[PDB]
Amino acid sequence: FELVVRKLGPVTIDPRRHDAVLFDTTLDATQEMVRQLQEVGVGTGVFGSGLDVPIVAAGRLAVRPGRCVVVSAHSAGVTAARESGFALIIGVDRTGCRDALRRDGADTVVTDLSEVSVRTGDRRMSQLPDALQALGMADGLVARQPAVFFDFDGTLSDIVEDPDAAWLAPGALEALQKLAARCPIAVLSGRDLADVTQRVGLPGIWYAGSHGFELTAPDGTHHQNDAAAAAIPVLKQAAAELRQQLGPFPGVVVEHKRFGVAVHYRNAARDRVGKVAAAVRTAEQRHALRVTTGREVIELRPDVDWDKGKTLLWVLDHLPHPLVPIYLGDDITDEDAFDVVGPHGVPIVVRHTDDGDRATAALFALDSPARVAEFTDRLARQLREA
Ligand SMILES: [Mg+2]
């Protein structure tokens, strides 16, 4: 395995996203590749020829398929890893079945495992210094003038199982108000632009909704990803389709947002899960959309590359000044933004009790969403200082 240092190669085992790697036994994964994974805290295991099937091998490591990588030189492995929702499936082409393997469900195919990279450099959330404590040291948190970025759910707002029941954590409104008088603020969210705007309820700042595909400036200028916007009518049609197809089956919900269809199947019986999936993959094929899985949801999104780092970099390019970013996030999508804050930027991760001590690119930690309101207040006070 080639080592990539706080970066992302072509094929990358990413500890932040990947808790284990399941190797096909026929592969000869060197002791050097397993040791590489051992230093970054990633478990290994083998499945395959008459041995364990991928999902079983994953169960022995106490790791969900959504957090596991499979590496397989055979078709059965690739396919079984595909129907089991594995996060990353690397096909190893040793018999020139690159096309076959990718038809099976390989996310990507390599000839030799030394083409696979392992991300190094991230620390585990445990290990990180506290943001509040750093903010109050002699030299403060930032040397240069900042622009501050917030994820909404899990960061500014306490996690809730009812999406509609997400509200600003106590004190976070007065805090954002103070800070907003002091520097540019931006809240990021996967919710529609209107929803997050209403829930923060604070004007004269940047709102980025629908996964950064559309934002509002302080002056109220609307901005939208042009290429992504073309898929808006496409998605309304998939939603219309999916509602007729899955309407007969109770416990299955089709939720339509401006840049996505989400199909909730928490209350769906066994064997409509495969049927809920089959319909979304039909919607996929038919409309050239992008499917991604939640825990009990399947989502269709515009087939346009984008992440939270690109939102951040874009918003920054439009800020007046060389403005240094401070970024606060709660989960996995926020790792894209930690990675591009630059040599003076401050990436902060909000810890939860059930988060499991993930590896992260963030430099600091805030203990819960409650401290985020506290951090915001003191930041506004430290900037008023200078
Ligand atoms: Mg969140």
Q: Could you please report the per-residue DSSP string of 279-311?
A: HHHHHHHHHT-EEEE-SSEEEEE-S----HHHH
Whether 151 sits among the annotated catalytic residues: the reply is: yes
Instruction: Give the tokens for residue 384.
Output: 């008023």
How far is Cα 272 from Cα 279, in angstroms, rounded to an integer? Answer: 10
> How far from chain centre, in Å, is Cα 84?
20
How far is CA 175 from each of CA 143, 207, 252, rounded to the nearest angstrom?
21, 17, 40
CA of 217 to the centre of ligand 1 (A): 21
Residue 247 CA, chain-centre distance (Å), reads 30
Residue 248, exposed/middle/buried by CB under 10 A (0-12, 13-18, 19+)? exposed
Is 299:120 a contact under the CB 8 Å cutoff?
Answer: no
* Sign of torsion over alpha carbons 301, 304, 306, 310: negative
Determine the longest span between alpha carbons in the chain, in angstroms: 68
Residues 6+ apart with CB under 8 A from 28: none
Structure tokens at 157: 């707002």
If you measure from the C-alpha of residue 168 to the centroid of ligand 1, how many angstroms do you get, rounded to a whole number? 13
336 annotated ligand binder:
no
Name the method of structure determination. Answer: X-ray
Specify the 3-state DSSP secondary structure of 11. coil
Whole-Å CA distances, 87 to 28, 78, 98, 249, 356: 22, 12, 19, 28, 18
Q: Do residues 169 and 372 touch, judged by C-beta distance below 8 A?
A: yes
For the record, the structure tokens of 152 come out as 């909404």
Structure tokens belonging to residue 383: 């900037």
What residues does 243 pair with on adjacent strands?
Answer: none
CA of 191 relative to ligand 1 center, distance in Å? 10
Compute the distance between CA of residue 132 and CA of residue 326 in angstroms, rounded to an integer.
13
Alpha carbon of 263 to ligand 1 centroid (Å): 19
User: In whole angstroms, how far apart are CA 121 and each of 40, 168, 355?
Assistant: 9, 33, 20
Per the document, the length of the chain is 386
Residues 34, 199: Cα–Cα separation, whole Å: 46
Q: What's the reported resolution, in angstroms, to a tenth?
A: 2.6
- Specify the DSSP class assigned to residue 96: S
158 annotated as ligand-binding: no
Going by C-alpha positions, the residue among 47, 46, 40, 88 that lies closest to residue 64 is 88
CA of 158 to the centre of ligand 1 (A): 9
Cα of 10 from ligand 1 centre, angstroms: 27
Nearest-angstrom CA–CA distance, 56 and 377: 48
CA dihedral 82, 84, 86, 91 (to 10 degrees): -30
Q: Which of 151, 158, 336, 377 is catalytic?
A: 151
d(CA 103, CA 154): 37
* 162 is known to lie in a ligand binding site: no
Residue 54 one-letter amino acid? P
Please, is 279 exposed, middle or buried when counting C-beta atoms within 10 Å of its C-beta (0-12, 13-18, 19+)?
A: buried
For residue 64, which of 110, 22, 120, 114 has the smallest C-alpha distance? 22
> How many helices and strands (H and E) does the chain possess?
13, 22
Residue 6 falls in which region: left (phi positive, over 0), alpha (psi -120 to 50) or beta: left
Question: Smallest Cα–Cα separation from 145: which of 356, 324, 365?
Answer: 324
Opening angle at CA 72, ends 67 and 76, nearest 5? 100
Q: Which two tokens stand for residue 39?
A: 């230093």
**Which distant-in-sequence residues (6+ apart) come within 8 Å of 258 by Cβ?**
192, 193, 210, 214, 232
How far is residue 203's CA from residue 74's CA, in Å, rounded to a whole number?
A: 55
CA of 162 to the centre of ligand 1 (A): 14
Q: Is 151 annotated as a binding residue?
A: yes
Distance 107 CA to ligand 1 centre (A): 26
